[PDB]
Amino acid sequence: EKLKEKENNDSSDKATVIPNFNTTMQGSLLGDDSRDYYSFEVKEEGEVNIELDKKDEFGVTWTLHPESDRITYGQVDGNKVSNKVKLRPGKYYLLVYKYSGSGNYELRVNK
Amino acid sequence: IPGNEKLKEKENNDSSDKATVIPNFNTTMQGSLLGDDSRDYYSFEVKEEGEVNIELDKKDEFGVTWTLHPESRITYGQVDGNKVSNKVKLRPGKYYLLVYKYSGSGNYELRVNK
Ligand SMILES: [Ca+2]
Ligand SMILES: [Ca+2]
Ligand SMILES: [Ca+2]
Ligand SMILES: [Ca+2]
């Protein structure tokens, strides 16, 4: 089961809401669509696993920052761009963006 | 720094094929990411293998960083106040340097040197 992104989401004030943990978002970065912003909320301090799965071969990663220099980057490894981050309760912004090519991805925040 | 030259970025540079060339390792690139302009691509050529320093200087307060990858293992800028920096050993070849923002708007300088 997945939830589709909602364009235009190219900046944080237009971020697509990830309504809960354990919700796979589906998106794409085709052509000049190079940025897809999402937001999520943390209600209790804890480890957050953020996982992007590439559905095509292309250069895509992500950058996490709180709504607030605390930023955190996705670690690329083959078809997965991942990280495990200790977050305090708060709203967070997750910029999915590409540096080469074009393609599709899924994004999940696991808690 | 003796010899340093300033050079303006050239829009449109929102994609690697339109990257603004950094022609040597003693140039200061001047750019801005205002409004809808959220990405500036640069490229440079490593002619000899060695350590390269990449430093983005924030002229204004805003959320900006960068991502390096080779034309042919990704490198990210490390944010520390007004400086976003890293050092990486590079082999000869063409490198793509994406300067991009995640919040706000403003100007920056970019210094790729050895
Ligand atoms: Ca999209
Ligand atoms: Ca988008
Ligand atoms: Ca610009
Ligand atoms: Ca630009």
Amino acid identity at A86: K
Sheet containing strand A59-66, edge to edge, reads A16-17, A35-42, A90-100, A59-66, A72-73
Q: Considering only CA atoms, which of B86, B30, B39 is closest in space to residue B58?
A: B30
CATH code of the domain containing B109: 2.60.120.380
Report which of B70, B106, B94, B71 is spatially closest to residue B84, judged by C-alpha positions.
B106
Residue B3 has what DSSP assignment? T
Give which of A2, A50, A60 is closest to A30, Cα–Cα: A60
Domain that holds residue B70: 1-114
Best residue of B11, B37, B69, B103 to probe chain A, by most A CBs closer than 10 Å: B103
Closest CA to B56 of B72, B71, B40, B34: B40
Chain B hits for A100, Cβ within 8 Å: 16, 69, 96
Phi then psi for residue A12, to 5 deg, are -65, -35
Residues B81 and B75: their CA atoms lie apart, in Å, by 19
User: How far is the C-alpha of B85 from the C-alpha of B110, rounded, in Å?
Assistant: 10
Say which amino acid occupies B14.
D
Contacts of A74 (CB under 8 A, 6+ apart): A50, A52, A61, A62, A63, A64, A81, A82, A83
Please state the domain count of chain A: 1
| Chain A residues within 8 A of B38 when measuring between CB atoms | 10-11, 35
Distance CA B72, CA B79 (A): 26
β B39-46/B5-8 pair status: unpaired
Q: Which residue in the set B38, B67, B103 is minimally distant from A99, CB to CB?
A: B67
CA distance B75 to chain A (A): 10
Taking the CB of residue B62, how many other CB atoms lie within 10 A of it? 17
Interface test with A, best of B18, B61, B102, B105 (most A CBs within 10 A): B102
Residues in chain B: 114
> How far is Cα A105 from Cα A98, in angstroms, rounded to an integer?
11
